[PDB]
RNA sequence: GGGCUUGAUUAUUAUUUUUCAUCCCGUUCCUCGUCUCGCCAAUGAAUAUUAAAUUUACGUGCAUAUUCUUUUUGGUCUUCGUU
């Protein structure tokens, strides 16, 4: 032996592929959930809303 | 197995035909010095036919040569090895069965073994074929999985080949395949497919077996399980070429143009030209274009790379594959202009198209009394396989 | 300039308390100014003189990550690295419009000149595994492709996303989602218009068709935002950035 | 390692030759702290009620350009001599 992942960069290869490699897509944001909640800030809040 | 770059380098480069400047810093993991017998002296063969020759050359030769005329008489602690180095009939030994293991070990073996190349070549390969089975041996997975490697690359004369041939389809195929967790990565591989690649297409170098195109368009390839992703990373330009030549060369498997189509197409990541525009036309079909690239081609390349040996095959069987498609459906369609293009007088031109006719991938009569080939129907009759498919 | 030299009371530089002085170590301070900036535009869509001089004050800012990178390290690392990063497309179609930017120097640190810029040596310098380029965290990369998409052909681009394995380190960490789809559509805008149907055809239908509902690169807040309330600021701070999008209308025209 | 007449200290006269762990900076090294990530385990089973095992509501009206500048190098103008 041996070896592990040959090219230049640095990282090099890691999976490819063969193309026809349709990628798909992505989107985020649809659910939360939280230990150690943050404050508000109610500073900023108030400002949007006067403007 | 495995390995090394540079060497990696040397090997592809001279290969797609570019230039020769290139290092090799070696030597570097064949070893330092152990079996065989170099591979860097191989690569400097073919060097020297490209293109005379350099300095690296005569580096490798003296390599080669020595470390030392003192430890080649030296080396043996006992016991065998002796008729001129093995022993041929110890290795016919070793099995049948012959499994449990005489003192232990052969450790001190491997020590005494070692030194090499010279190269010597024939013999060389012997002793470890020899080595290789003990079976018991202590000592080891990875050392032995090494030495299949350096038996799979040299030599090549014919009866280590052929016990190569076998000896990669069942050990090397599964190795690269898990479990084992987690072996083997991307270099391995490609060194793997280069070595495989060499013993047998036709580079310049040698090649062909019979037939050993088959073992080259198996592997690397075939869906159960697949990888090809191997193949593409990162960027084989020179494989994806002599692969084009290697399933024209073949002429079936069954699926033949299609799969070599798929495989081109990998569009500009890496992509060399010559063999590559004469199947891609071919296959896609056009048949003014196709028929004046493969004498173009043929030509061409040649270059340099000598052997020769196959691509008169190559062209033959080009020539035939095309005239074929144009046949099939199409006309109906005659014969003087066919003749004059491949380009002797019209009876063996006539009879050359009755042959492609008679292998019952097409039904057509000639007319040789009116000079036109007429093709039956078949291809189409309708109503009545309807009826036969229900009944 | 008379510094370095640094007396009278204490100085130092990291840790304890100087501390506008600590974190422009560092620079932190910088990233403060970044953040701020992007904020400012991020509101106001362009329109009046207001862009225009926003436009100037940001190539302003530039030329002090540049030079700053030469007061070395601290090691540092990174945070003026980062914001250069951030601030590249810079820029660009073939680049256009970093030369007239480039003009007052002293300019200095690595990344400069019309002949660069791309990117790809702060990509390289600064790696990936180990040392750098972490935090945060999968990178430049991102960048990289899109610069290599817009000034070079959709196949570098594409090459590159496919060969690094970047499709898993963009479902978690939310900056970079946005980042994710921002390179497709732009791959795929690339790959029409220079001039082929597919690969522009399949990167831009999956981009596409779904989901309506297109946040995703730019602008336009979903549904519904921005009447509902304070929760308004998490659709309108994932991200979207600004002077860029790239153009809407073009991308449904290559789609179409 | 870099800088530093750093603390002993050649230095300071250019015998400058340092001369080291060190002050200020200092990763890919060892030890320690802490955070992130993780596999499993921990608080949600009625077939009948004697002083009660869990409390509403959570919406309106108001909301800073919030300043003084001395300016000085160009550039649009103007009024004298003279061609």
Redesign the interface.
């Known amino acids: 032996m041996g070896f592990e992942l040959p090219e230049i960069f640095v990282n090099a290869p890691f999976t490819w592929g063969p193309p026809p490699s349709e990628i798909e897509m992505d989107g985020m944001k649809v659910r939360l959930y939280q230990k150690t909640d943050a404050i508000a800030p109610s500073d900023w809040l108030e400002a949007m809303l006067d403007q | 197995?495995?390995?090394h770059?540079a060497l990696?380098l040397l090997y592809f480069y001279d290969e797609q035909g570019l230039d020769v400047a290139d290092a090799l810093r070696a030597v570097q993991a064949t070893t330092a010095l152990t079996a065989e017998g170099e591979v860097s002296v191989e690569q400097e063969r073919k060097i020297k036919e490209t293109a005379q020759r350099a300095r690296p050359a005569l580096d490798e030769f003296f390599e080669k040569s020595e470390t030392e005329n003192s430890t080649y008489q030296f080396k043996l602690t006992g016991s065998e090895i002796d008729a001129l180095r093995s022993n041929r009939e110890l290795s016919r030994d070793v099995l049948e069965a012959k499994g449990i293991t005489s003192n232990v070990m052969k450790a001190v073996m491997e020590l005494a073994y070692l030194y090499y190349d010279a190269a010597r070549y024939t013999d060389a390969s012997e002793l470890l074929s020899l080595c290789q089975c003990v079976v018991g041996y202590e000592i080891d997975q990875?050392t032995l999985?090494?030495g299949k490697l350096v038996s799979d690359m040299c030599t090549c004369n014919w009866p280590s080949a052929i016990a190569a041939a076998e000896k990669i389809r069942r050990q090397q195929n599964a190795d690269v395949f898990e479990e084992d967790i987690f072996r083997?990565?991307?270099?391995?591989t490609?060194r793997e497919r280069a070595w495989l690649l060499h013993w047998v297409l036709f580079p310049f170098f040698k090649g062909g077996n019979q037939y050993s195109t088959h073992l080259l368009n198996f592997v690397f390839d075939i869906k159960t399980n697949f990888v090809?992703?191997s193949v593409?990373?990162?960027v084989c330009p020179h494989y994806l070429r002599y692969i084009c030549a290697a399933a024209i060369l073949n002429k079936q498997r069954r699926s033949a143009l299609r799969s070599a189509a798929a495989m081109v197409l990998?569009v500009?990541?890496y992509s060399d030209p010559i063999t590559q525009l004469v199947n891609a036309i071919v296959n896609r079909q056009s048949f003014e274009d196709a028929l004046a690239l493969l004498p173009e081609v043929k030509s061409t390349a040649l270059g340099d790379y000598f052997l020769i040996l196959h691509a008169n095959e190559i062209l033959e069987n080009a020539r035939r594959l095309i005239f074929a498609r144009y046949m099939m459906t199409h006309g109906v369609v005659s014969i003087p202009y066919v003749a004059e293009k491949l380009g002797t007088r019209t009876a063996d031109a006539e009879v050359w198209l009755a042959n492609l006719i008679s292998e019952t991938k097409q039904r057509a009569k000639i007319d040789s009394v009116s000079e036109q080939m007429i093709v039956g129907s078949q291809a189409r009759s309708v109503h009545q396989t309807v009826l036969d498919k229900l009944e | 300039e008379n510094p370095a030299i640094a007396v009278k009371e204490v100085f130092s530089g990291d840790l304890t308390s100087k501390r506008a002085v600590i974190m422009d170590g560092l620079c932190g301070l910088l990233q403060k100014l970044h953040v701020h900036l992007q904020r400012i535009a991020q509101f106001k869509t362009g329109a009046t003189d207001e862009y225009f001089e926003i436009i100037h004050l940001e190539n302003q800012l530039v030329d002090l990550a540049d030079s700053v990178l030469g007061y070395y390290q601290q090691r540092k690392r990174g945070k003026a690295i980062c914001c250069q990063i951030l601030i590249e497309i810079l820029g660009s179609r073939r680049q256009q419009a970093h030369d007239i930017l480039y003009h007052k120097m002293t300019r200095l640190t690595r990344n400069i000149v019309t002949t660069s810029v791309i990117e790809t040596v702060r990509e390289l310098y600064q790696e990936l595994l180990v040392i750098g380029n972490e935090e945060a965290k999968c990178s430049a990369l991102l960048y990289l492709a899109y610069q290599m998409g817009l000034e070079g052909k959709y196949r570098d681009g594409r090459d590159l996303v496919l060969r690094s394995g970047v499709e898993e380190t963009v479902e978690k960490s939310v900056h970079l989602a946005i980042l994710y789809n921002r390179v497709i559509a732009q791959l795929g805008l690339a790959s029409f218009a220079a001039g082929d149907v597919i690969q522009a055809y399949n990167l831009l239908s999956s981009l596409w068709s779904n989901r309506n509902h297109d946040v995703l690169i730019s602008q336009r807040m979903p549904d519904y935002v921005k009447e509902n309330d304070e929760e308004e600021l998490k659709f309108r701070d994932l991200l979207v950035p600004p002077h860029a999008y790239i153009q809407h209308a073009q991308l449904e025209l290559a789609t179409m």
Do not use: H
């Not at chain 2, 083997?184 to 391995?188: D, E, I, Y």
């Open positions: 197995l495995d390995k770059l990696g990875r999985l090494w083997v990565a991307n270099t391995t490609t090809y992703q593409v990373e990162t990998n500009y990541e």
